[PDB]
Write a protein that binds this ligand. Structure first.
Ligand SMILES: Cc1cc2nc3c(=O)[nH]c(=O)nc-3n(C[C@H](O)[C@H](O)[C@H](O)COP(=O)(O)O)c2cc1C
Ligand SMILES: Cc1cc2nc3c(=O)[nH]c(=O)nc-3n(C[C@H](O)[C@H](O)[C@H](O)COP(=O)(O)O)c2cc1C
Lengths: 191, 191
């Protein structure tokens, strides 16, 4: 329902860190609305080289344990503190949408362009989440690459996870981080 | 031109370069479009991208070059196919090249700096749309052909994220089919 001009939004959009991410999450219906909106990205060849996996409820707690398991079998036993990170890897926010790339050899489309799309679809999710009243963090901790975890959540060898998008509410004021300067990144030609 | 974010996410449509028109953004307006576009998620805050803004005459110089290389390749293409090439960059007032500059970092995977480039291209479209300009995200032979890349100064450690053609549009674009959530999203857990 809530309104924000597009221009004011681009000037102010700021991610919220997963810890700062409180409850409530969104209803399955709100969430369907967010994705129905995110899958409206540029996609050369009209291929939809991505897929989403929505994690919410108790199953987050169960995954974070699969992640705690793998993590220790990885490193016998170090800091108990770090072990909490793994217990709450997926429970810091109410919902976590995993954005999987499913890019592969195509007869006309380069996996590069199919990858640029998943790049863009990840921002379109953050865009739909903020526009829908929620705050978002786009992570990919080791869980994105560690093959013992990737198997436990169903992303194959032929796929790469693009990001885990934690969605929630928050009571925390956005603070700005340093941005790139245009003398440093943009370059002009012709007038 | 004062549009709201939620409605915007529902109607957002690329209009093709071919039907993009004069006037484009002033250097002023372009600077803001990019000042706005470089605020993207970006692990390691290392800005793995750069932009090149092709305007006015150097657009013809470049299209002219495309055609030269497209004749070196195949010295007998129709006066039609030649037209297209001497037209590549003169379809829209402005053309902004987004370049990925991803190299091995010591903490940030190259994959995550590529995700950020995809992000940045949409973000530019958002900034351009938000400023009253249509925009089409192209990448044709000219994004991958090493002959041409060398004339525009895109190194070997670099790849072109896309050529974002930006201009003014008279009528809104017709929508195209989007994915069915049923096909592209699976749900895990309940509440
Ligand atoms: C990385 C990337 C490269 C693309 N290159 C082309 C191209 O060379 N020619 C073309 O007709 N469309 C190309 N497209 C598709 C267009 O941008 C098309 O306008 C877009 O898919 C429509 O998306 P929209 O309706 O959500 O705005 C590309 C899309 C992406 C993400
Ligand atoms: C593909 C990708 C993976 C990321 N993974 C992490 C992570 O595992 N941990 C972390 O503290 N930040 C991570 N980040 C950075 C953030 O998302 C951070 O919110 C971003 O740099 C903030 O940009 P913004 O203030 O314009 O929203 C990642 C960014 C991208 C594009």
């Amino acid at each position: 329902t809530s309104d924000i001009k597009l221009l004011d939004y681009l000037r102010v959009r700021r991610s919220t860190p997963a810890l700062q991410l409180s409850e409530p999450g969104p209803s399955k219906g709100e969430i369907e609305e967010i994705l129905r909106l995110a899958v409206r990205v540029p996609d050369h060849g009209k291929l939809a080289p991505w897929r989403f996996v929505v994690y919410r409820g108790e199953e987050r707690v169960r995954l974070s344990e699969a992640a705690l398991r793998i993590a220790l079998e990885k490193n016998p036993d170090l800091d108990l503190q770090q072990q909490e990170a793994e217990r709450t890897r997926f429970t810091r926010a109410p919902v976590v949408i995993a954005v999987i790339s499913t890019a592969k050899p195509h007869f006309k489309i380069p996996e590069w362009e199919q990858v640029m799309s998943a790049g863009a679809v990840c921002l379109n999710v953050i865009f739909a989440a903020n526009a829908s009243g929620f705050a978002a963090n786009w992570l990919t901790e080791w869980l994105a690459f560690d093959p013992a975890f990737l198997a436990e959540i169903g992303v194959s060898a032929e796929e790469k996870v693009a990001g885990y998008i934690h969605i929630g509410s928050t009571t925390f004021p956005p603070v700005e981080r340093p941005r790139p300067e245009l003398a440093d990144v943009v370059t002009w030609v012709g007038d």
